[PDB]
Amino acid sequence: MRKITVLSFITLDGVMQAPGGPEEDTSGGFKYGGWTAPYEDEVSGKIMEKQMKPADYLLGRKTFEIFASYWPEHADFWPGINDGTKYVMSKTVKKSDWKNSVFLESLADIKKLKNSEGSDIQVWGSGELIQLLFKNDLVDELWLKIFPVTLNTGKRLFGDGTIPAAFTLIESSVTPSGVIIANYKRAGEVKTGTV
């Protein structure tokens, strides 16, 4: 079995759409592409490089295409994404010029990929795919960066796939710019008492 880690940049109110630039995702006329920009720091970069260790990848087709437009030409900065096998969920695209690209069509394919052998799987972006993962409880770890801004509109990490589920805080840090690094692990059912 493989460890599927979802990594995600979110606002205070959970919005994940277009973190890196004004045209990254204009669905809905989203006006706030690039909201992570004013919060990029040195410390933040060091955290990123630890998360940019080579591994395998599971991506939604849109996130894969966004990546394919940029990252093959910058294999220096992020080698793992070029070197590791990228598993892409799509009914639309069955081939890519990007090296190490395998295309999956159904939930069963994702599951077999989990029950396979190989490097642990990272999931970046891919909010729509993440909803299917959450709904079938296939995500084992969550690495969030939480940014000191609120934007009502936008695609959300915790969307229509989210399920009642408990987590364990594995690690937390704070950047100088005010971003909170919080990594969690799945921990069984939700507990309620009376305070």
Q: Which residues of the chain form contacts with ligand NAP (CB under 6 A)?
A: 8-9, 16-19, 24-25, 60-63, 89-93, 124-129, 132, 155
Q: How far is the CB of 52 from its own copies (least distance, A)?
A: 14
Nearest-angstrom CA–CA distance, 88 and 104: 6
Selection from ligand NAP, its own copies, none that 81 binds (CB < 5 to 8 A by kind) is: none
Dihedral (Cα; 145, 150, 155, 159), 10-degree rounding:
80
Residue with Cβ nearer ligand NAP (117 or 164): 164
Q: Which residues pair with 9 in a beta bridge?
A: 145
Q: Could you give phi then psi for residue 10, rounded to 5 degrees?
A: -135, 150
Residue with Cβ nearer ligand NAP (117 or 195): 195
Contact 107, 67 (CB under 8 A): no
Q: How far is the CB of 7 from its own copies (least distance, A)?
A: 15
Selection from its own copies, ligand NAP, none that 45 binds (CB < 5 to 8 A by kind) is: none
Chain residues in the site for its own copies (CB under 8 A) = 12-14, 19-22, 32-38, 40, 142, 144, 146, 148-153, 157-158, 162-169, 172, 174, 178-180, 182, 184, 187, 190-195
Nearest-angstrom CA–CA distance, 177 and 100: 36
Contact 18, 26 (CB under 8 A): yes
